[PDB]
């Protein structure tokens, strides 16, 4: 259902996803409308998003309850378009062809919105569901009665189309009486039997629409004992415990520590030109995805010409950013230009390194 080339060629799906995210359509166009990337590879990066979207789309709801319910669990809202109006009616249509056909036939005239569904209440919701209305409101007229007549034999032929030769464990038919020719008695009043056949038929239709599948030692001990003694030798003058002894030594220790405190403090855990900031951000995103495609390809490998095109484009982008920095220094001056250079230093270094690495690999392959 989902394939790499399939999502690649799902152009309408791809454009729908373009409509999905402003950021997405923006980055895509600036990778395209800026004479940049063919969309093919651009999606070739983004494939999982496409797959996810596609699956989120073509997701048929079950038949089952809502399908049924559309005849039972739906007996109140006599107003306008009720809950899940289009959803419920399509569930009806898949559930019952007759109503779909009647509604279609009654489009050019007789609106099936209010009056159609009003007469439908009587006609169908007596036909299906509850007992035979027979008397009472016999509004089942015209299309209703016609479709009634139809649906009768229609359900008949369906039921006909349902009969399997059930496996002989369950075969009640062959089980009953079709062993003997016997003479019993029987004693255990029309209508409603049709009701039972109705529920059976509904359920089985539902299920079928689902089966469809659609030093050490010596000196060690010596020194140890020495210390042990020293301890035992009263001593342990906590007064004599250094305090700091050499005021100089003390000072030096403090120096070290304040130095380290300063350095680690330098860790203060706001650009000027908001419009140029956003523009530079766009440039960074652009160069990032461009390099992304190379560092994919330059690793992986026979599509060498594609790598060549990517490399030429990347060199173009590098020169473009160089000119960008030149223009920034010209216009914004230095401090703002300095801030821009700082903001773009990492990406700039990465792309420059990628360019150098490609140059080295190209020289190695050539020489």
């Amino acid at each position: 259902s989902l394939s790499k080339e399939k999502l690649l060629t799902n152009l309408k799906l791809q454009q729908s996803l373009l409509k999905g995210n402003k950021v997405l359509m923006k980055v895509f166009q600036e990778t395209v409308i800026n004479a940049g990337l063919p969309p093919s590879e651009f999606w070739s990066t983004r494939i999982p998003l496409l797959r996810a979207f596609a699956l989120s789309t073509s997701q048929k709801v079950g038949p089952y309850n809502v399908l049924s319910t559309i005849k039972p669990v739906a007996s109140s809202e006599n107003k306008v378009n009720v809950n899940l109006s289009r959803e419920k009616i399509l569930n009806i249509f898949e559930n019952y062809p007759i109503v779909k056909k009647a509604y279609t036939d009654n489009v050019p005239k007789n609106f099936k919105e209010p009056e159609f569904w009003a007469r439908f209440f009587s006609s169908k919701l007596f036909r299906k569901l509850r007992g035979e209305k027979i008397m009472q409101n016999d509004r089942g007229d015209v299309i209703i009665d016609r479709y009634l007549t139809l649906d009768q034999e229609f359900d008949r032929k369906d039921d006909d189309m349902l009969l399997h030769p059930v496996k002989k464990i369950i075969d009640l038919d062959g089980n009953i009486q079709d062993d003997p020719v016997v003479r019993g008695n029987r004693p255990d009043s029309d209508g409603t039997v049709d009701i039972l056949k109705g529920m059976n038929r509904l359920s089985e239709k539902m299920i079928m629409a689902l089966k469809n599948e659609y030093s050490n030692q010596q000196m060690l001990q010596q020194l140890s004992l020495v210390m042990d003694n020293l301890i035992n030798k009263l001593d342990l003058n906590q007064v004599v415990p250094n305090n700091e002894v050499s005021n100089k030594i003390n000072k030096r220790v403090i120096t070290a520590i304040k130095i380290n405190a300063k350095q680690a403090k330098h860790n203060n855990v706001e650009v000027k030109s908001t419009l140029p900031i956003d523009l530079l951000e766009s440039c960074r995103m652009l160069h990032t995805t461009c390099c992304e495609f190379l560092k994919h390809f330059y690793i992986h490998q026979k599509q060498a010409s594609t790598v060549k095109k990517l490399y030429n484009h990347l060199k173009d982008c590098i020169e473009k950013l160089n000119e960008l920095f030149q223009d920034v220094l010209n216009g914004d001056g230095e401090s703002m230009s300095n801030t821009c250079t700082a903001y773009l230093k990492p990406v700039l270094n990465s792309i420059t390194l990628a360019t150098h690495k490609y140059d080295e690999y190209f020289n190695e392959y050539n020489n």
């Binding site: 797959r51 089952y64 689902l210 860790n267 960074r284 995103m285 990492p346 270094n349 990465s350």
Partner: protein, 351 residues
């Protein structure tokens, strides 16, 4: 009177990497009144807890969250390795209320689609927190189950207060037949421990499968503060990491490099793994009258040993549950603590 596991008989293999796709259940059933707020609120709370826990103990895996509302499976968190995203997603959900019927089939198919990108060495999984007593499928299900087991996708589900035949078949099917994974609960505490035991990697007796070396590299923290600049979210962040190879900043994570796409870790994640691979022998409870050992703790120093002949009190037992290999005592609290939190056995470390 003891309740202990007799022995661990797969202390040789587990799935260390994981990609578990928890799927909740947000459907009309979950609104009954058996668990204190409801099924649903308690479920989501424990789900948050489990998310924290699982992303702790398996800090190299990913995860995605899936609901089942109105017979549809609507992804609520892409498969991702950052716990906070999933946590927030669950936060958002918990204020929203269930509807429709649980469409187990749709959720299953959405997962199977979702886990395709996961590479061979990574291992797949799903964890259905199934709450209802029915499904509503728009297709054959055994078709899906067959596709699943074809794609080597183990599944574990935690039913609520009943047993559903199809789910039992599902667990029995994907997990190489060996049925133990359809555990259903009978109490809230049982539920907490259910999630807890879902946290760990999952062995049964692994078939001999492909075992593959995976390229990855470790980063080095950065120094500057004002030079705040990020290459995984394109912000200003006061300092982060460097891919050793891609050589671009990446906000703090065990994430995958967003430039050259290789896994990043420090080691402490690998340390957690080590802890899971080769655990200890379960500490033995010493005989009541046959111990004649030291009257203290060993790791701690507790005074809870015995009472020396007290009709029924001494006849009860002798709190001396003592590990095997180091053969040193340990009070009950110390043994519980060792076997739960820190797995270096105190004495067995020292020799």
């Amino acid at each position: 009177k003891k309740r202990t596991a007799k022995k661990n008989i797969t202390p040789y293999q587990r799935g260390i990497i994981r990609s578990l796709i928890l799927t909740l259940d947000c459907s009309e059933a979950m609104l009954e009144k058996d668990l204190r707020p409801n099924r649903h609120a308690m479920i989501i709370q424990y789900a948050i807890d489990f998310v924290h826990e699982f992303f702790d103990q398996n800090p190299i895996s990913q995860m995605g969250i899936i609901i089942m509302r109105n017979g549809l499976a609507q992804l609520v968190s892409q498969v991702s390795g950052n716990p906070q995203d999933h946590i927030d997603a669950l936060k958002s959900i918990r204020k929203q209320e269930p509807k429709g019927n649980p469409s187990l089939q749709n959720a299953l198919e959405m997962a199977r689609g979702l886990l395709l990108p996961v590479p061979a060495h990574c291992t797949r999984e799903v964890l259905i927190v199934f709450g209802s007593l029915s499904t509503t499928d728009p297709g054959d299900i055994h078709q899906t189950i067959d596709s699943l087991v074809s794609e080597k996708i183990r599944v574990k589900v935690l039913g609520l207060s009943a047993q559903v035949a199809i789910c039992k078949e599902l667990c029995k099917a994907t997990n190489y037949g060996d049925e133990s994974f359809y555990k259903i609960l009978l109490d809230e505490t049982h539920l907490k421990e259910l999630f807890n035991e879902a946290v760990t990697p999952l062995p049964v007796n692994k078939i001999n499968k492909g075992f593959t070396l995976v390229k990855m590299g470790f980063p080095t923290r950065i120094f500057e503060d004002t030079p705040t600049f990020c290459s995984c979210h394109s912000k200003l962040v006061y300092g982060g990491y460097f891919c050793p190879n891609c050589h671009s900043k990446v906000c703090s994570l065990p994430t995958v490099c967003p430039c050259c796409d290789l896994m990043l870790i420090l080691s402490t994640h690998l340390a957690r793994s080590y802890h899971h691979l080769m655990p200890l022998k379960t500490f033995a409870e010493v005989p009541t009258t046959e111990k004649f050992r030291s009257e203290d703790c060993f790791s701690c120093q507790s005074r809870f040993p015995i009472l020396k002949n007290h009709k029924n009190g001494k006849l009860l037992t002798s709190s001396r549950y003592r590990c095997e290999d180091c053969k040193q005592e340990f009070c009950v609290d110390c043994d519980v603590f060792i076997h739960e939190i820190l797995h270096n056995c105190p004495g067995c470390e020292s020799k």
